[PDB]
Design a binder for this molecule. Structure first.
Ligand SMILES: [Mg+2]
Ligand SMILES: [Mg+2]
Ligand SMILES: [Mg+2]
Ligand SMILES: [Mg+2]
Ligand SMILES: [Mg+2]
Ligand SMILES: [Mg+2]
Ligand SMILES: [Mg+2]
Ligand SMILES: [Mg+2]
Ligand SMILES: [Mg+2]
Ligand SMILES: [Mg+2]
Ligand SMILES: [Mg+2]
Ligand SMILES: [Mg+2]
Ligand SMILES: [Mg+2]
Ligand SMILES: [Mg+2]
Ligand SMILES: [Mg+2]
Ligand SMILES: [Mg+2]
Ligand SMILES: [Mg+2]
Ligand SMILES: [Mg+2]
Ligand SMILES: [Mg+2]
Ligand SMILES: [Mg+2]
Ligand SMILES: [Mg+2]
Ligand SMILES: [Mg+2]
Ligand SMILES: [Mg+2]
Ligand SMILES: [Mg+2]
Ligand SMILES: [Mg+2]
Ligand SMILES: [Mg+2]
Ligand SMILES: [Mg+2]
Ligand SMILES: [Mg+2]
Lengths: 153, 394, 60, 15
RNA sequence: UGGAGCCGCCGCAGGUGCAGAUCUUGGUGGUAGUAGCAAAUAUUCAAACGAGAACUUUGAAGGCCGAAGUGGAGAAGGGUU
RNA sequence: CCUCUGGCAUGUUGGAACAAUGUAGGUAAGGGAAGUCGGCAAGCCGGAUCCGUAACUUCGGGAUAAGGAUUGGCUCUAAGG
RNA sequence: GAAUGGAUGAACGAGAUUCCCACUGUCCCUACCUACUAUCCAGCGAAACCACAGCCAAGGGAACGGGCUUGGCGGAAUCAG
RNA sequence: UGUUCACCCACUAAUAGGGAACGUGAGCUGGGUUUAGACCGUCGUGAGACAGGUUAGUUUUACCCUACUGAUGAUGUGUUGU
């Protein structure tokens, strides 16, 4: 398929996407901003730290009510969280793009995450029963992720 | 309409932003006015709140019902091991204010002091004042040093010494010794500066600053109490039992029509850990620390002319949440700001003291030395060993 | 692996609660392929599933 | 929709 | 971009031009990763399975319902649970 | 209220903290309703045995009126078939 | 004001008052403790409301302005209240 | 006394007077006014009436913006600490 923002030198730029993933769009977005521009081996480390809370993902855009944390000071920011599902869902994606580099025949530990982008995916809906017999929505806001790595060292 | 029944308002506005103090070490916001006439001296000291206790004393205010009657009296022990002067720092008057002009540091500086200059000492290579101290042993540096001191002689007006604590000698956890600027108040600036230039790298004990029966101002940070509601933080009335949305509140924040809530209205926020300068705390006892001529001299602390035992101010089982006061200490009347272990600035008074009460000579009759770690009933361990007799642990 | 069925059948064979059914946790897999009763009655006789004793309530 | 008030409460009562 | 029809002029005809109607139907935001997932005392250790275990299962312990039961059976109602 | 038989996994989640406000419990020196529209709320009282029981009365009641004392553990005695 | 019933009245009342005894955090005057919250985190995740928006003083003005006039002034993004 | 108001006792230095949407109900309370239930008086043929008396009667929502309270931070100074 067409990715937004096609690569500069396709020769040496592996690809990935994962469509229609049950991962909070907003959390997935912030952790995708965090990861962006990293060398793939750093990125992986960074997400496993986020998984165990040794580093945070600063929640910059979608930061309404999100707590402060000392770990955010690394990023130059006050907010920050440890979104685990998001890190588990773009550690799989990284795995796949790394897969495809290896298949394509690129140096895997020269790969920079050049482009990554979280879109909203069509919403699910299940209901929540409310006071005075009102029935409100209770909808997941899943996300399409996609990304592009590149040989840069 | 007017408020029906008048009442004075809760809390003082002369104390607010009721926020958590930036500093931990309480700043001396004003040193006394150096008359140029009396000889040079230090105006301030830096102690530590070790703990409270009793005293007993004959009082001599004639007229009172308590004249020639032994009262008891609470007191704070401020353990005050001698400070080390490691600097001077010249100031000059301007119409803008009082600009710092030139800071000359000493040659050798302790790791007690050097600690302060790094946020993480474990991780540092401890490289501070390293290229500085090169100055103190050559022709070039020593000359520049002298020219700096000369310039300060020409230009400066206020001179403050920089000293720091001897964190080494305390029962506290921390090693990072508190520095502080202390002002030299006395004769002419050239005399004033050559005094502090002589004192450089040297000890300064408490008795050199203060004397007995002297009113001094304690400066420190208050014992902090976190987020607190308006009823705690402002001592507002509680509302009654029936109040539906809670009752440790203020009911009417404000009127409608200055349509903003005013700065004078009581709100919940930080209670405690404020900076506060309590004044007129009379020194009952400047106490000599433990020392050795052949054996220990532990007596010299809490023994009085009338008691004559072998105590120190340390109670049985020590001062609680603190340690042993093994160093020289002052003994103020009454409570003072802050917690146990808190660093505490003393300061000579801003004020011409000439009240009957402020010139009163204190002869102590008896220092209570019973444990504070429970209801104590024995003044010393030897007394306890006498009273009890032998125990199964023998 | 999953022995809620074997505990039910065992209980019904023993005519006890299923509190009182004890399945040997070491020999689990043998119990797992017990599906029928009479397979279970066999395991009752072999001593892999056993009726526990009553919790003692002394009258003393 | 949201309940808000009872029938005999009729919020802003000004008789 | 798309992939099969469409327009100019002269006449005739009309269910012919929207920002509003607490307008109708459909969709989407900010609010917000916020409120919230607090009734009824309680969980812990090891193992098994398994890609994966705070939650499954087994064993061990600690707890509750305390025979007006959180037990054992029906009526009505459900309709394959 | 505690237990066996039988039954459950704390009622749609977990973890870390222990701030203000709350919801639900408790306790408070001296005073004792001064609080408030109003003793609202909570507190006192409480079982049993033994005494003792007013006004009034439709003579039945009032009446657990009020007001008092005792109560455990242990070792015996006497009395009831 | 006399079966539109008048006067009475023991017993009874989750009925309306007043006083006394007791008792108490109702109060003087507030304080400390416990549990569940709120708090921070993982997972999950609504709603009302919404012309645009959101610092003030005064003026005039449909005679009480966030916006206008004249002044004061104005510093990202946020957290708990 | 629901009261505003009023009056009385007591203390006191003094027990001055007002304003802020007759300040202040997403601050309370709800005693009183002011639904529906009922009683009494007067009025009405009556249904009903009464600034005439009585008793019983659901007091919702803040997570938005501001304001205030406290809490991280912000631009600058080359970075950092004092
Ligand atoms: Mg619901
Ligand atoms: Mg319903
Ligand atoms: Mg006044
Ligand atoms: Mg209420
Ligand atoms: Mg003590
Ligand atoms: Mg076609
Ligand atoms: Mg038509
Ligand atoms: Mg339209
Ligand atoms: Mg939450
Ligand atoms: Mg059954
Ligand atoms: Mg529970
Ligand atoms: Mg559970
Ligand atoms: Mg349930
Ligand atoms: Mg009390
Ligand atoms: Mg009163
Ligand atoms: Mg009263
Ligand atoms: Mg009551
Ligand atoms: Mg009676
Ligand atoms: Mg008549
Ligand atoms: Mg008649
Ligand atoms: Mg009549
Ligand atoms: Mg407006
Ligand atoms: Mg008003
Ligand atoms: Mg209001
Ligand atoms: Mg209200
Ligand atoms: Mg009422
Ligand atoms: Mg009515
Ligand atoms: Mg919140």
């Amino acid at each position: 398929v067409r990715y937004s923002l096609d690569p500069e030198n396709p020769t040496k730029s592996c690809k990935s996407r994962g469509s229609n993933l049950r991962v909070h769009f907003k959390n997935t977005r912030e952790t995708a901003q965090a990861i962006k521009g990293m060398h793939i081996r750093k990125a992986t480390k960074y997400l496993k730290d986020v998984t165990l809370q040794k580093q945070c993902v600063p929640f910059r855009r979608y930061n309404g009510g999100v707590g402060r944390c000392a770990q955010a000071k690394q990023w130059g920011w006050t907010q920050g969280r440890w979104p685990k599902k998001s890190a588990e869902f773009l550690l799989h994606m990284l795995k796949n793009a790394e897969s495809n580099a290896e298949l394509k025949g690129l140096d895997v530990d020269s790969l920079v995450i050049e482009h990554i982008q979280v879109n909203k995916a069509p919403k699910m809906r299940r209901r929540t029963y409310r006071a005075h017999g009102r029935i409100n929505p209770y909808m997941s806001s899943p996300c399409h992720i996609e990304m592009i790595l590149t040989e840069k060292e | 309409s007017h408020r029906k029944f008048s009442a004075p308002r809760h809390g003082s506005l002369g104390f607010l932003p009721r926020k958590r103090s930036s500093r931990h070490r309480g700043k001396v916001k004003s040193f006394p006015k150096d008359d140029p006439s009396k000889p040079v001296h230090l105006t301030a000291f830096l102690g530590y709140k070790a703990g409270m206790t009793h005293i007993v004393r004959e009082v001599d205010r004639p007229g009172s019902k308590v004249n020639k009657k032994e009262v008891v009296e609470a007191v704070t022990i401020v353990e005050t091991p001698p400070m080390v002067v490691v600097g001077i720092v010249g100031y000059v008057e301007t119409p803008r204010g009082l600009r710092t002009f030139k800071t000359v540091f000493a040659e050798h500086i302790s790791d007690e002091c050097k600690r302060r200059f790094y946020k993480n000492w474990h991780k540092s290579k401890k490289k501070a004042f390293t290229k500085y101290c090169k100055k103190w042993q050559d022709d070039a540096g020593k000359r520049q040093l002298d020219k700096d001191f000369s310039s300060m002689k020409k230009y400066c007006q206020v001179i403050r010494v920089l000293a720091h604590t001897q964190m080494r000698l305390l029962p506290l956890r921390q090693k990072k010794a508190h520095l502080m600027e202390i002002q030299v108040n006395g004769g002419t600036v050239a005399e004033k500066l050559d005094w502090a230039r002589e004192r450089l790298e040297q000890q300064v004990p408490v008795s050199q600053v203060f004397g007995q029966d002297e009113m001094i101002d304690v400066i420190g940070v208050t014992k902090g109490k976190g987020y607190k509601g308006v009823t705690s933080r402002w001592h507002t009335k509680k509302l009654p039992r029936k109040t539906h949305r809670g009752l440790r509140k203020v009911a009417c924040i404000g009127a409608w029509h200055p349509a903003r809530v005013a700065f004078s209205v009581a709100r919940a926020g930080q209670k405690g850990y404020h900076h506060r300068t309590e004044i007129n705390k009379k020194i009952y006892k400047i106490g000599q620390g433990y020392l050795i001529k052949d054996g220990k001299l532990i007596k010299n602390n809490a023994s009085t002319d009338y008691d004559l035992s072998d105590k120190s101010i340390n109670p049985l089982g020590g001062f609680v949440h603190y340690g042993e006061v093994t160093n020289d200490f002052v003994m103020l009347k009454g409570c003072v700001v802050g917690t146990k272990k808190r660093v505490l600035t003393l300061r000579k008074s801003l004020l011409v003291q000439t009240k009957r009460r402020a010139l009163e000579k204190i002869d102590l009759k008896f220092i209570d030395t019973t444990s504070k770690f429970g209801h104590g009933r024995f003044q010393t361990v030897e007394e306890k060993k006498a009273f009890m007799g032998p125990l199964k642990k023998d | 692996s999953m022995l809620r069925l074997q505990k039910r059948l065992a209980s019904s064979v023993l005519r006890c609660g299923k509190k009182k059914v004890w399945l040997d946790p070491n020999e689990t897999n043998e119990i797992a392929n017990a599906n029928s009763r009479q397979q279970i009655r066999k395991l009752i006789k072999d001593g892999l599933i056993i009726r526990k004793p009553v919790t003692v309530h002394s009258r003393a | 929709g949201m309940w808000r008030f009872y029938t005999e409460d009729s919020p802003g009562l000004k008789v």
